[PDB]
Structure formats: C-alpha cells, structure tokens
C-alpha cells in the first residue's frame, strides 16, 4: 500500500547513495588541463529550400550526402546535399509529421507523427516510385521519434509513454518498452544498436535494450521535459537536452550526469542535440533560434550557428562529421561546415 | 560524371514542379485545430475557401508537446462546454494556450457550447455558477450585449459572464499578435468569418496598418 511507496523511496535512496559514492570528481575537474576549443566559425554552405511549412525532423543518409527532411506541410523531401537537388519528395497522408528516419541501408524512409502510424517508404522500389512499404499501427499516441535498426526493424517512441520495436516485414510490435510516465519525446540508437536511450516528458531518460525489452537504466537530473537525446559516438555516454534549458551528459556505467551545459542568458529549452564525430562538439538547437556548439568536456560554448529565423527544430551531423544540417521552423535546412 | 548530374538536375526540376503545385494547394487551405487514428482531418469548403480542421482524438490528456505542431494553424477552435469544474478546466486550458510561446501568434475561435443546457440549468434552480464563480454574484450584463429572444436575464447573465471570463484572460496579453473570438453555439459560417478576420488582421499587420 502506502508503505510499498516508502520501500520504493528507500530503494531509490539506496540508488542515490550508490551513485554519489561513485562520484568524487567531475568531468570538469579532470578537464581543467585539456586544450580549449576555439570559436567555431561555421558558415552556411548549402541552404536547402523547398519545404512549405516548419521542418520538424531531418535525418542524414549513412553515406552522408542524402538527407530526408519531414515538414509539417505533409512532405518528406530526400535531398542531395552536395548539389542541393531534391532526389525525392514523398507526399504523406497525414500532414502532421513529427519525425522522420532514413534507413541505414538507404532503401527505406520512415515518417510518423500525430496520426499515430509509422509510415515506411521504399525508395528503391522497382524503378523509382516512392510508395508506402508498411504502415505500422499499434501506438496509442503521437509518434515522437522513429529510428530504424535494420531494414527489417524500427523502434518508435510515442506519446503514449511507450517505445516499441517493430518488424517491418510483418507489421507488428516485436517488443514494447514501457516504464515512462510522460510522453517519450526522443530516442537515440547506440552505435552497436543493441541498446537505445529514450528521454521523456517526465524529465527522465531510460536506457533499454531491443533484445530483452526491460529497462536497463534510468537517468534523472533534468527538471523539465527532455526534448532531445543523442548518443556519444562510443555508445557509453549520451547528451540529453531538455526544456529547462540545459544539456546534460549521462554516462551509462557511471549511471549519472557527467556535465551540464547551461548558461545564465540561455532560458529556452534545447530542441535538438547532436554530437560531432569526435564527440568534442555537442551542437544544440534552441528556441532562441540558434544552435550553440558546446565543448562537451569543458562545458563552455565554443560557437553559435545563428542563421535561422525561427526555432531550430532539428539538427543532425553527418556520419563522417563532414557537415551539420539544421532545419528549423522557418522551413529552411542549412548545411554548416 | 556530367550526365548523371544532368539526370539528377532534371529530377530536381520535375520535383520542383510538384512542390510549386503543392505550395498552391497548401497556401490555399486553412488549417484549423478543433480543441474541444490519432488525428481526424475533416475537410470542409465554404464559399470555395478550403478548410481542413483537425480534431485531435486518440491522444493523451497531456498536450504541451503536440500543441506546438499547431502553431501555424490559422485558428484554434476552442469548444468549451458551459455547464469537477469543467468550465474552469477550460478557462485554464485557454489561459495556457493563450500565453504559450508558440501559440502566441495563433488566434483562437472560442465556442461557448451548450447554451440551452445552461438555460435549463439556470432557470431550474441548479445555479452552480454563483457557487463556483462568486464574482458572478456581483455581475451586471453589459449594455453592449444582445439578449436575442428566448432569453430572460438569468441565462444572458451567465452566458456573457462566461465569455467575460475568457475575454478577461484574452485581453490581459496578446494585443495585436492573436485574437480570441468568442461565440455561443451556421456554426461553420462563424469559423469562416473569423478565419477571414484572422487572415485580414495578419495581412494588415504585415503592412503596419493595424
């Protein structure tokens, strides 16, 4: 009854003691002697225009030249970023697209949003006519993020406080990861794609695994909703960016926050987090319309991107670190290098 | 090589025709949000002007994240059932929609639903309106208020008091960026007239004529 909540309180108190027992130094304390990072001048190389409403998600191909971008007009444009040429423009059934994904093979593209269905599109179908390969229904709220593991598996976070591992060839939920008490706003697959982290509106992140299905770890520390989450490129850390206007670096084995990228003048929440190839730059889109580039170790903002006329909804760095595309609510994708 | 770039550029050209043709359809339609399987588009067309309203059903009761998708709708349709106090439950939701950062340019068309229900409530002796709003006990129906017939001054009291609550939230902030249009539930003509009025005020604001 009520004393069961007391025993859970003592258990999480034991967790708090076991996590401050393994904390005697910081990430900032070890990094007082490392080299700084200069003012990161990134000029907008390409400006992909061609979306009619606010771009809510973009995603890079794994060859790092094709990027899909979903906007709220109902359109899913695959761009060649090297030439600013549109490769495809898939019209979508529902116009409210809160997420997009590109398959790592490059054949499929997911989308999803307030329609509660993940639509999987084949790009290389027979000769090129982008039709819907699979509509994955089974979620009870809006889809917030979707990330392909294989061509055959996807994982979709939803606003029904639940992530879900699907099977594209069959169309049904292989695994259902429950445990969040708020809308799961994002997810990020590991470089090994065995685990994935998922932050929600209850200010908590959770580390899962697609094999078993139970929650491996839980990360508190944020004050409000986690709008964005991304993995450090080794799979051992991840940066969460929330609506309390902080980013935080949580490590899995350390099981707690290593660094907190905040500022006094910064008051609005981080819409998107992304890392560089080295993990030395944590780029973070904002609702003050500019992506600050945080030195991940030193926690002082190296650069600012600052080209967007509206809220930087989406922000994605390439696989090879060669460029960084920021889409925004002004319907323009900017490629920074 | 140069030939595949030519093929890619002709594909870009044939995609830009469809995006040009889709911009014409997208700028013509008015997106609404009915805020009385996870979304129910209902396209309707009055006076050849295309609307498509979005009734967000099969969503959770926690709206602080999917309401930002609807920051670029022309209007939020806010159907409030004038009777847990579920009138203050809509007063507070209007208070948070009005003062939200992204819906701060998005106007609200406010439908004060169920006025016949309120009439048979207030004349029968089930006046909870004085118990849940004691500021109604000192209220006086304004001189710029129409008691259209079938109305004694006990239902046009509570009715205009309830829109005065919402216009007390609405006129605190948001002077020129967005507007609340209160109505008492022909119902589609009011949405059309107020969307014409939203679009006109947006255009008059883009010229600094308002």
């Amino acid at each position, epitope marked *: 009854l009520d004393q069961l909540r007391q025993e859970a309180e003592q258990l999480k108190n034991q967790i708090r003691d076991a996590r401050k027992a393994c904390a005697d130094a910081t990430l900032s304390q070890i990094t007082n002697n490392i080299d700084p990072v200069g003012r990161i001048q990134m000029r907008t190389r390409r400006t992909l225009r061609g979306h009619l409403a606010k771009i809510y998600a973009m995603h890079w191909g794994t060859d790092s030249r094709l990027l899909v971008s979903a906007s709220q007009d109902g359109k899913l444009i695959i761009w060649d970023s090297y030439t600013t040429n549109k490769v495809h423009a898939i019209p979508l059934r529902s116009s409210w697209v809160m997420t997009c994904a590109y398959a790592p093979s490059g054949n499929y593209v997911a989308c999803g949003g307030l329609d509660n269905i993940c639509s999987i599109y084949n790009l290389k179908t027979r000769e090129g006519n982008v039709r819907v390969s699979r509509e994955l229904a089974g979620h009870t709220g809006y889809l917030s993020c979707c990330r392909f593991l294989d061509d055959n598996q996807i994982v979709t976070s939803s606003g029904d406080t639940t992530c879900a591992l699907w099977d594209i060839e069959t169309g049904q939920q292989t695994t259902t990861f429950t445990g969040h008490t708020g809308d799961v706003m994002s997810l990020s697959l590991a470089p090994d794609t065995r685990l994935f982290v998922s932050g929600a509106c209850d200010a908590s992140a959770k580390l899962w695994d697609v094999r078993e299905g139970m929650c491996r770890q839980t990360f508190t520390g944020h004050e*409000s909703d986690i709008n964005a989450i991304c993995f450090f490129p080794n799979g051992n850390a991840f940066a969460t960016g929330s609506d309390d206007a902080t980013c935080r670096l949580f490590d899995l084995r350390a099981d707690q926050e290593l660094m907190t990228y905040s500022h006094d003048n910064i008051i609005c929440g981080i819409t998107s987090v992304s890392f560089s190839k080295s993990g030395r730059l944590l780029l973070a889109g904002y609702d003050d319309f500019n992506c600050n580039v945080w030195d991940a170790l030193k926690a002082d903002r190296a650069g600012v991107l600052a080209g967007h006329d509206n809220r930087v909804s989406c922000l994605g760095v390439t696989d090879d670190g060669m460029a960084v595309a920021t889409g925004s609510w002004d319907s323009f994708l900017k490629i920074w290098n | 090589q140069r030939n595949e770039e030519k093929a890619q550029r002709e594909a870009n050209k044939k995609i830009e025709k469809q995006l040009q043709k889709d911009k014409q359809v997208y700028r013509a339609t008015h997106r609404l949000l009915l805020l009385g399987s996870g979304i129910f588009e209902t396209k309707f067309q009055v006076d050849k002007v295309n609307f498509h309203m979005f009734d967000v059903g099969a969503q959770r009761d926690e709206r602080r994240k999917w309401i930002q998708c609807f920051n670029d709708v022309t209007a939020i349709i806010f159907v409030v059932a004038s009777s847990t106090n579920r009138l203050q439950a809509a007063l507070k939701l209007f208070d948070s929609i009005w003062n939200n950062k992204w819906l701060r340019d998005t106007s609200v068309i406010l439908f004060l639903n169920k006025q016949d229900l309120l009439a048979e409530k207030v004349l029968a002796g089930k006046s909870k309106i004085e118990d849940y709003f004691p500021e109604f006990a000192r209220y006086t129906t304004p001189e710029d208020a129409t008691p259209e017939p079938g109305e004694d001054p006990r239902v046009t009291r509570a009715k205009y008091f309830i829109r005065d609550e919402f216009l007390r939230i609405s006129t605190a902030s948001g002077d020129g960026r967005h507007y609340c249009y209160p109505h008492f539930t022909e119902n589609i003509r009011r949405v059309f007239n107020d969307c014409r009025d939203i679009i006109q005020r947006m255009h008059l604001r883009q010229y600094e004529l308002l």
Partner: nanobody
Amino acid sequence: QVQLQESGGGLVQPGGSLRLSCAASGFTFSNYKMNWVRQAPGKGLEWVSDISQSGASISYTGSVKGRFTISRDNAKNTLYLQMNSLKPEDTAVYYCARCPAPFTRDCFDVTSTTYAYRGQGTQVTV
C-alpha cells in the same frame, strides 16, 4: 529527480484551518509557476490556485476565492496553501503541482491524469 513532498494535511471540522506545504527539491523553485490541484473523492482533478515565479500573480478557483490564500517562499523552496473556513465540498487530496517549463506564462497539463511533476498529495478531510 523532481520531488514534490506535500505535508501538513489532516482532519478538521468545517470552519477550521489547515496549512499545507509542499517541500520541492530537484529543481530551481523560483523559475517555476507552482499550483495546487485537489482531487475530490468522487471526481477527477480540480485545479485550485496557481502562483507565479515572483509570488504576486495569484489566481484561484472561485470555490476557494476569499477563503484560501497561497504564498511561496523562494528561499526555503516552499509553497503554502493556508486554508480557512472549510466546507464539506473542500475535502480532497491536495496535490501541489508544478508547471513544466521555466519562465513560461503557460501552465499546461497540471490537472492531467498522469502528470509528472505533481506530488503525492495530502488527504485533507472534513
């Protein structure tokens, strides 16, 4: 972890007084608009009274207007609901909520069924 620890709720006859307090840890208390959400025995979640970051923007339901008086003390990370002249329609579980974002005039989903930043609630019984 955002922790809302309500306290001070007991039993009293109609016309009495109680002083609720929600001890709030895990977040900077001054940046958030707080709230008081009561839940009746027979109904859902009724908002009662909010107070903004400073403590000068105070609103109430009319069911508690003139009778209850909230105040926050930002230094001790506390939020009070002084209760006076209680009615049998005021017996409820009083959750002390906290709108999610900082520095925002909007206050969403506070009375929702599964809101995150809401406490466990003092049962106030008359």
